[PDB]
């Protein structure tokens, strides 16, 4: 859209102003039901050829069902919390006597339903598969005949298509040990997810956002095994809610900033330690330092608020003017001077120091820019690759407008050698 | 001591949907399954309906499907019948039946007759 | 109403044998091996005497014998008794998810 | 394979923080940011400064408000906890928890003598 | 003298059921079942190779293609451990599946075999 | 003992042709393209003369010609020699994982 950033030379940092928050600040459970019947002994005589196939399929199905039965830089500042908390609570609710029977009875003929539980929670129940009807109307009458004589090769083949799911679901639940992330398409098909989205009690904007980005809401969801009593496989999906929608917010990148002293090892320098995302939620700001948790998709970010900071709203003031008596503006100081570079949304920041070649080149005319000293900026639509020392970075090539403001080397304000070389967590 | 006790019946005018009730005692009820048969004077037995554990799955007869509903309430250990649009040919005695061994829905495992009941007589007249 | 054909009545002297039968089709009685024979005295509830062609319940005398052949189920007795005057019914599973009863036969002794 | 063979005299430090028998490693700083953690049977909340704190449940709603200093809520009193603008779901599996009364150890020390420049230190 | 187990029997099937049919003059298999059951006896192998082409030799956790649940239970009751360890590590097959490693071994003489590293439980 | 039938004996003049054969069932010498023709002089071990229906090994004459038709395997020779008085056998693969020989024919020259 209008992705723009303003590189401030005061402290080497890129602020990619202009995005949309779409934060995730809510959990919504949903119960997905696979119905299945309990077969007795096979009661089929004669090996034949197709009878062997049916026997293998039924044996593997029973093995799957019995296996599933036998189943039942600011990172330190973040708090911790349980992610599977709503799913386990709903499962513990389902363990109560006379509860899954409500799920089965109420969901008799429709596919989707809304029911009540012991504690009064209204969750969405959805039948995903209908193995009961197929196994009690199309296979057992054929197999239970005396002198089993399967005359239809289709019998087995379509059976495969109606067994695969109940097989491979179990497969995943045997590998991930109960909970799976992300929810695979076997656990929830795309059309199934789309149908389930438009039944949640949420506003129209939330439905539009979460229906148009099914891949991301698939990546951020959880799954958990529940009771299997009364021959009804039930598992809880944890499709995330989306409280705040369409509030402008930004991403901040930092880089080292050191003096070019001739004497090696005597160039003290500080770097801002705030890399990550800042999103304007309510009258405060929500801060995500973990850049790996935040997901990006076409100007819209999707980030879990469970790992965040409730930072005060007066944080853009520190971003604009570093030296203000209104925010401590956390930093970290060291005497290590090693060439490095970062790749922001619309350009490349270079912080190479000392005897180390620095270059920026493109595939058209080759070498275009050479960096002398200090951290510098190259816009994305001027260059294609950047290189520091002996390593090569590919700058992002997505359209946008970038403006490179002029600043001053703030570390020259400080005395040549009074700084400590000890802190990973300090402030101005 | 396995025994079934019946309730309801009598003379019913054409139409006049009548709810019929069975009962059981002396054995586990939520495990075994039940079904319902009827017999008319001068004729034989005629399959009427079948219910497995809970209201999970219900099987109906070809000549009766649609006109009849059968369900169960395990809290009161009772079995209920609702038939509407009663015709002139429903004059008969209704019998409860107990069948099945485990938690199964396939009707092939559900044809056993371990016990029977006493039946209720229902007749229509004008 | 579809049913299963059975003889109207059979009569035999005490201490003899009978060959009662009921005929169906390829998808009922003749298959699925679920043939059942039920007793009925007048004014009394029916009882299960034979199930799954030849298997027998508890408390039944060994005089009965059930079998199936082609599309016909057959019941045979030995040593007829005066209390055998009753009604016989054959019940078996039909392919279209139903349990089909017979027409009823009357057994009398002379 | 990824463990520490810590000496058996570790429960004493757990019970009484100030004992001449163990280091009782700590890390101190001057950063004050609201945060909370979810234990096995409850929620610990350390919200500080001008930041709203709440503990609520799906039946009666808001039940407890934390004034200042770190506090604890048992799992079977609440269903969700919220600090600042973020919401945590507390564990909901049965158990018995007892909340002993202590003292704010930080008040024993001098108001400002601490270093705030370490990640690996002991008492 | 750790162990050894044969998980599949492609020898018998491919030397007694498929090659006699295919090696005939102008081979024209009329049995549609032939191919289909062949799929069931090939899938496993294919899938195994698939995993070994993604994780570059070592895989965590051991997928159920590598060892089916009943297979793991049978292999559990053979290793020389006490009864308590057998009961504990047999009743939590998903966890002992999550903590095991699978590695490539030799392939010579068409006896392609891999080493599973099911963890022990001392204390 | 199952085997492959062959003529008891054949006699030929020098420089002539014979068309001897051995017959079997479908899961036998018939088809499968595994016809083998094998030599035997008395007191000496057999030598390979024909394998794979019509193919011939190294260091052997091209005078022999083997073929198959329906359920029969046939051997023809041109330019008979006095040293051809010997025993002839046909070897073929039976579908039940076995390699079956023939009954043995005696070739003599006159």
Short mmCIF file of C-alpha atoms in Angstrom, two decimals, chain A residues 60-384:
data_model
loop_
_atom_site.label_atom_id
_atom_site.label_comp_id
_atom_site.label_asym_id
_atom_site.label_seq_id
_atom_site.Cartn_x
_atom_site.Cartn_y
_atom_site.Cartn_z
CA UNK A 60 -5.56 -51.03 9.97
CA UNK A 61 -8.65 -48.97 10.88
CA UNK A 62 -9.08 -50.89 14.14
CA UNK A 63 -5.36 -50.53 14.86
CA UNK A 64 -5.64 -46.77 14.31
CA UNK A 65 -8.65 -46.47 16.62
CA UNK A 66 -7.00 -48.55 19.36
CA UNK A 67 -3.77 -46.54 19.03
CA UNK A 68 -5.73 -43.30 19.40
CA UNK A 69 -7.50 -44.82 22.41
CA UNK A 70 -4.09 -45.63 23.90
CA UNK A 71 -3.19 -41.98 23.28
CA UNK A 72 -5.61 -41.09 26.08
CA UNK A 73 17.32 -8.67 21.79
CA UNK A 74 14.64 -8.32 24.47
CA UNK A 75 13.66 -12.00 24.71
CA UNK A 76 14.32 -12.29 28.44
CA UNK A 77 11.81 -9.59 29.39
CA UNK A 78 8.78 -11.46 28.02
CA UNK A 79 6.48 -13.32 30.36
CA UNK A 80 5.36 -16.88 29.73
CA UNK A 81 1.91 -18.42 29.53
CA UNK A 82 0.10 -21.59 28.58
CA UNK A 83 -1.00 -21.65 24.94
CA UNK A 84 -3.23 -24.75 25.20
CA UNK A 85 -5.43 -23.52 28.03
CA UNK A 86 -8.87 -23.17 26.44
CA UNK A 87 -8.60 -26.48 24.61
CA UNK A 88 -7.59 -28.43 27.70
CA UNK A 89 -10.38 -26.77 29.70
CA UNK A 90 -12.97 -27.73 27.08
CA UNK A 91 -11.58 -31.27 27.04
CA UNK A 92 -11.85 -31.49 30.83
CA UNK A 93 -15.45 -30.30 30.47
CA UNK A 94 -16.10 -33.05 27.92
CA UNK A 95 -14.78 -35.67 30.36
CA UNK A 96 -17.84 -35.06 32.55
CA UNK A 97 -20.48 -37.77 32.39
CA UNK A 98 -23.44 -37.17 30.10
CA UNK A 99 -21.81 -34.45 28.00
CA UNK A 100 -20.68 -36.02 24.71
CA UNK A 101 -24.17 -37.53 24.52
CA UNK A 102 -25.50 -33.98 24.12
CA UNK A 103 -23.02 -33.46 21.27
CA UNK A 104 -24.22 -36.60 19.51
CA UNK A 105 -27.96 -36.11 20.11
CA UNK A 106 -28.14 -32.40 19.26
CA UNK A 107 -25.98 -32.88 16.14
CA UNK A 108 -28.20 -35.64 14.78
CA UNK A 109 -28.76 -34.62 11.14
CA UNK A 110 -27.21 -31.19 10.48
CA UNK A 111 -23.46 -30.66 10.15
CA UNK A 112 -22.90 -27.54 12.27
CA UNK A 113 -24.58 -26.85 15.60
CA UNK A 114 -24.38 -24.68 18.72
CA UNK A 115 -24.78 -26.49 22.05
CA UNK A 116 -24.32 -25.81 25.75
CA UNK A 117 -21.96 -27.58 28.15
CA UNK A 118 -21.78 -28.15 31.91
CA UNK A 119 -20.29 -24.73 32.70
CA UNK A 120 -22.57 -22.85 30.29
CA UNK A 121 -20.01 -22.36 27.51
CA UNK A 122 -21.58 -22.19 24.04
CA UNK A 123 -19.09 -23.78 21.65
CA UNK A 124 -19.45 -24.64 17.97
CA UNK A 125 -19.80 -28.35 17.18
CA UNK A 126 -19.08 -29.57 13.67
CA UNK A 127 -19.27 -33.07 12.22
CA UNK A 128 -16.38 -33.47 9.81
CA UNK A 129 -16.78 -37.10 8.75
CA UNK A 130 -19.71 -39.51 8.51
CA UNK A 131 -18.11 -42.95 8.81
CA UNK A 132 -21.14 -44.18 10.78
CA UNK A 133 -23.46 -44.12 7.76
CA UNK A 134 -20.92 -45.58 5.33
CA UNK A 135 -19.81 -48.38 7.66
CA UNK A 136 -23.38 -49.26 8.71
CA UNK A 137 -24.99 -49.04 5.25
CA UNK A 138 -22.41 -49.85 2.54
CA UNK A 139 -19.64 -52.15 3.85
CA UNK A 140 -20.92 -54.37 6.67
CA UNK A 141 -23.91 -55.73 4.65
CA UNK A 142 -21.48 -56.80 1.91
CA UNK A 143 -18.75 -58.24 4.14
CA UNK A 144 -20.98 -60.09 6.62
CA UNK A 145 -22.50 -62.33 3.93
CA UNK A 146 -21.69 -66.02 4.10
CA UNK A 147 -18.92 -66.94 1.62
CA UNK A 148 -17.87 -63.25 1.26
CA UNK A 149 -17.90 -62.68 -2.54
CA UNK A 150 -17.03 -58.97 -3.16
CA UNK A 151 -18.25 -58.31 -6.75
CA UNK A 152 -17.47 -54.54 -6.82
CA UNK A 153 -13.79 -53.39 -7.03
CA UNK A 154 -15.09 -49.86 -6.21
CA UNK A 155 -16.06 -51.23 -2.73
CA UNK A 156 -12.45 -51.10 -1.50
CA UNK A 157 -11.35 -48.04 -3.46
CA UNK A 158 -13.92 -45.54 -2.22
CA UNK A 159 -13.44 -47.08 1.22
CA UNK A 160 -9.84 -45.87 0.99
CA UNK A 161 -11.08 -42.33 0.38
CA UNK A 162 -13.33 -42.57 3.45
CA UNK A 163 -10.62 -44.11 5.65
CA UNK A 164 -7.53 -42.02 4.80
CA UNK A 165 -8.68 -39.11 6.95
CA UNK A 166 -9.37 -41.16 10.09
CA UNK A 167 -6.01 -42.83 9.48
CA UNK A 168 -3.75 -39.87 8.87
CA UNK A 169 -5.32 -37.62 11.50
CA UNK A 170 -4.38 -40.33 13.99
CA UNK A 171 -0.93 -40.39 12.40
CA UNK A 172 -0.36 -36.73 13.25
CA UNK A 173 -1.78 -37.23 16.74
CA UNK A 174 0.83 -39.95 17.22
CA UNK A 175 3.75 -37.79 16.07
CA UNK A 176 3.05 -34.46 17.79
CA UNK A 177 1.89 -36.20 21.01
CA UNK A 178 -1.57 -34.74 21.42
CA UNK A 179 -1.29 -31.13 20.24
CA UNK A 180 -0.39 -29.99 16.72
CA UNK A 181 0.70 -26.63 15.30
CA UNK A 182 -0.26 -25.62 12.68
CA UNK A 183 -3.62 -27.35 12.15
CA UNK A 184 -3.09 -29.45 9.03
CA UNK A 185 -5.70 -29.54 6.27
CA UNK A 186 -6.61 -33.11 7.28
CA UNK A 187 -7.68 -31.80 10.68
CA UNK A 188 -9.66 -29.01 8.99
CA UNK A 189 -10.25 -28.75 5.24
CA UNK A 190 -10.24 -25.28 3.69
CA UNK A 191 -13.96 -25.24 2.89
CA UNK A 192 -14.64 -26.58 6.38
CA UNK A 193 -12.63 -23.74 7.92
CA UNK A 194 -14.38 -21.17 5.73
CA UNK A 195 -17.79 -22.51 6.79
CA UNK A 196 -16.74 -22.50 10.45
CA UNK A 197 -15.51 -18.89 10.27
CA UNK A 198 -18.91 -17.45 9.29
CA UNK A 199 -20.64 -18.99 12.33
CA UNK A 200 -18.49 -17.49 15.08
CA UNK A 201 -20.11 -14.65 17.07
CA UNK A 202 -17.88 -11.90 15.67
CA UNK A 203 -18.35 -8.68 13.72
CA UNK A 204 -18.33 -8.48 9.93
CA UNK A 205 -14.85 -6.95 9.68
CA UNK A 206 -13.35 -9.81 11.71
CA UNK A 207 -15.10 -12.38 9.50
CA UNK A 208 -13.82 -10.63 6.38
CA UNK A 209 -10.25 -10.46 7.69
CA UNK A 210 -10.07 -14.02 9.04
CA UNK A 211 -11.82 -15.51 5.99
CA UNK A 212 -9.48 -13.87 3.46
CA UNK A 213 -6.26 -15.09 5.16
CA UNK A 214 -7.04 -18.74 5.89
CA UNK A 215 -3.37 -19.74 5.63
CA UNK A 216 -2.29 -17.39 8.43
CA UNK A 217 -5.20 -18.27 10.72
CA UNK A 218 -4.28 -21.88 9.96
CA UNK A 219 -0.68 -21.28 11.05
CA UNK A 220 -1.73 -19.60 14.32
CA UNK A 221 -4.30 -22.18 15.46
CA UNK A 222 -3.90 -25.12 17.83
CA UNK A 223 -5.41 -28.58 18.14
CA UNK A 224 -5.95 -30.83 21.16
CA UNK A 225 -7.29 -34.34 21.69
CA UNK A 226 -10.45 -34.74 23.77
CA UNK A 227 -12.52 -37.69 24.98
CA UNK A 228 -13.10 -40.67 22.70
CA UNK A 229 -15.80 -42.32 24.78
CA UNK A 230 -19.14 -43.40 23.27
CA UNK A 231 -17.45 -44.06 19.90
CA UNK A 232 -17.15 -40.40 18.94
CA UNK A 233 -13.70 -39.00 18.20
CA UNK A 234 -13.73 -35.38 19.32
CA UNK A 235 -10.91 -32.87 19.11
CA UNK A 236 -10.84 -29.17 19.95
CA UNK A 237 -9.46 -26.65 17.50
CA UNK A 238 -8.48 -23.26 18.90
CA UNK A 239 -9.08 -20.83 16.05
CA UNK A 240 -7.70 -17.48 17.26
CA UNK A 241 -9.88 -14.43 17.73
CA UNK A 242 -8.95 -10.95 16.48
CA UNK A 243 -9.89 -8.12 18.82
CA UNK A 244 -8.23 -5.00 17.43
CA UNK A 245 -8.35 -4.53 13.66
CA UNK A 246 -7.03 -1.78 11.37
CA UNK A 247 -4.85 0.36 13.61
CA UNK A 248 -1.69 1.82 12.07
CA UNK A 249 1.60 0.48 13.39
CA UNK A 250 5.22 -0.04 12.48
CA UNK A 251 8.37 -2.17 12.59
CA UNK A 252 11.69 -0.98 14.01
CA UNK A 253 15.13 -2.31 13.04
CA UNK A 254 18.47 -1.39 14.62
CA UNK A 255 22.13 -1.71 13.68
CA UNK A 256 25.53 -1.14 15.31
CA UNK A 257 26.92 2.40 15.30
CA UNK A 258 30.61 2.81 16.15
CA UNK A 259 33.35 5.38 15.58
CA UNK A 260 36.14 4.85 13.06
CA UNK A 261 39.03 5.16 15.49
CA UNK A 262 42.45 4.29 14.05
CA UNK A 263 43.48 2.37 17.17
CA UNK A 264 41.87 -1.06 16.93
CA UNK A 265 39.78 -2.07 19.92
CA UNK A 266 39.29 1.47 21.25
CA UNK A 267 36.06 2.40 19.42
CA UNK A 268 33.37 2.25 22.09
CA UNK A 269 29.83 2.19 20.75
CA UNK A 270 26.19 1.75 21.75
CA UNK A 271 23.30 0.22 19.80
CA UNK A 272 19.57 0.58 20.37
CA UNK A 273 17.99 -2.69 21.50
CA UNK A 274 14.36 -2.47 20.37
CA UNK A 275 14.14 -4.63 17.22
CA UNK A 276 10.66 -5.85 16.47
CA UNK A 277 7.12 -4.57 16.01
CA UNK A 278 5.20 -1.77 17.73
CA UNK A 279 1.43 -1.75 17.27
CA UNK A 280 -0.95 0.92 18.57
CA UNK A 281 -3.47 -1.05 20.61
CA UNK A 282 -5.94 0.88 22.81
CA UNK A 283 -4.38 3.88 24.59
CA UNK A 284 -1.02 2.13 24.92
CA UNK A 285 1.32 0.33 22.51
CA UNK A 286 1.93 -3.41 22.26
CA UNK A 287 5.58 -4.35 21.72
CA UNK A 288 6.75 -7.60 20.12
CA UNK A 289 10.55 -8.07 20.29
CA UNK A 290 10.43 -11.59 18.86
CA UNK A 291 10.50 -10.94 15.12
CA UNK A 292 10.00 -14.67 14.50
CA UNK A 293 6.50 -14.74 16.04
CA UNK A 294 5.14 -11.87 13.94
CA UNK A 295 3.83 -12.89 10.51
CA UNK A 296 3.51 -10.54 7.54
CA UNK A 297 1.07 -10.74 4.63
CA UNK A 298 0.45 -7.90 2.16
CA UNK A 299 0.70 -4.86 4.46
CA UNK A 300 -1.20 -6.74 7.23
CA UNK A 301 0.66 -8.20 10.19
CA UNK A 302 -0.58 -11.08 12.33
CA UNK A 303 1.07 -11.39 15.73
CA UNK A 304 0.23 -13.20 18.95
CA UNK A 305 -0.20 -10.80 21.86
CA UNK A 306 0.49 -13.51 24.46
CA UNK A 307 4.20 -12.65 24.18
CA UNK A 308 4.33 -8.85 24.24
CA UNK A 309 4.93 -5.75 26.33
CA UNK A 310 2.23 -3.27 27.36
CA UNK A 311 4.48 -0.34 26.61
CA UNK A 312 3.26 3.20 27.36
CA UNK A 313 1.88 5.19 24.44
CA UNK A 314 4.71 7.75 24.65
CA UNK A 315 7.09 5.63 22.59
CA UNK A 316 7.03 7.43 19.22
CA UNK A 317 8.57 10.42 21.00
CA UNK A 318 11.67 8.35 21.75
CA UNK A 319 11.65 7.13 18.15
CA UNK A 320 11.67 10.66 16.73
CA UNK A 321 13.98 12.40 19.23
CA UNK A 322 16.31 10.02 21.06
CA UNK A 323 17.26 12.56 23.76
CA UNK A 324 14.00 13.45 25.50
CA UNK A 325 13.14 13.52 29.24
CA UNK A 326 10.09 11.33 28.68
CA UNK A 327 11.44 7.83 27.89
CA UNK A 328 14.56 5.93 28.87
CA UNK A 329 15.17 4.62 25.31
CA UNK A 330 16.89 1.33 26.16
CA UNK A 331 20.37 0.80 24.69
CA UNK A 332 23.32 -1.57 24.98
CA UNK A 333 26.99 -0.60 24.82
CA UNK A 334 30.05 -2.61 23.80
CA UNK A 335 33.55 -2.13 22.43
CA UNK A 336 33.16 -4.84 19.77
CA UNK A 337 33.33 -3.51 16.20
CA UNK A 338 32.39 -6.24 13.71
CA UNK A 339 31.02 -5.54 10.24
CA UNK A 340 27.31 -6.33 9.93
CA UNK A 341 24.25 -5.26 7.97
CA UNK A 342 20.47 -5.61 8.18
CA UNK A 343 17.72 -5.68 5.57
CA UNK A 344 14.68 -3.56 6.39
CA UNK A 345 11.35 -3.47 4.56
CA UNK A 346 12.43 -1.06 1.80
CA UNK A 347 16.22 -1.01 1.90
CA UNK A 348 19.48 -2.16 3.42
CA UNK A 349 21.29 -0.70 6.43
CA UNK A 350 25.06 -1.22 6.47
CA UNK A 351 27.24 -0.88 9.58
CA UNK A 352 30.60 -2.13 8.30
CA UNK A 353 33.65 -0.86 10.19
CA UNK A 354 37.42 -1.02 9.97
CA UNK A 355 39.39 -2.77 7.23
CA UNK A 356 36.41 -4.44 5.57
CA UNK A 357 35.18 -3.87 2.03
CA UNK A 358 31.55 -2.77 1.73
CA UNK A 359 29.64 -2.71 -1.54
CA UNK A 360 26.15 -2.35 -2.99
CA UNK A 361 25.57 -3.61 -6.53
CA UNK A 362 22.72 -4.50 -8.88
CA UNK A 363 22.29 -6.92 -11.78
CA UNK A 364 22.05 -4.13 -14.39
CA UNK A 365 25.21 -2.00 -14.15
CA UNK A 366 26.98 -3.87 -11.38
CA UNK A 367 28.67 -2.04 -8.52
CA UNK A 368 26.86 1.20 -7.75
CA UNK A 369 27.61 2.31 -4.18
CA UNK A 370 30.65 1.96 -1.93
CA UNK A 371 30.34 2.68 1.80
CA UNK A 372 33.28 4.52 3.37
CA UNK A 373 32.56 4.40 7.12
CA UNK A 374 29.69 4.61 9.58
CA UNK A 375 26.23 3.12 9.15
CA UNK A 376 24.57 4.03 5.85
CA UNK A 377 21.38 3.30 3.92
CA UNK A 378 20.66 2.06 0.41
CA UNK A 379 17.12 2.27 -0.94
CA UNK A 380 15.63 -0.92 -2.33
CA UNK A 381 14.87 0.55 -5.77
CA UNK A 382 18.43 1.66 -6.38
CA UNK A 383 20.27 -1.58 -5.73
CA UNK A 384 19.64 -5.33 -5.83
#
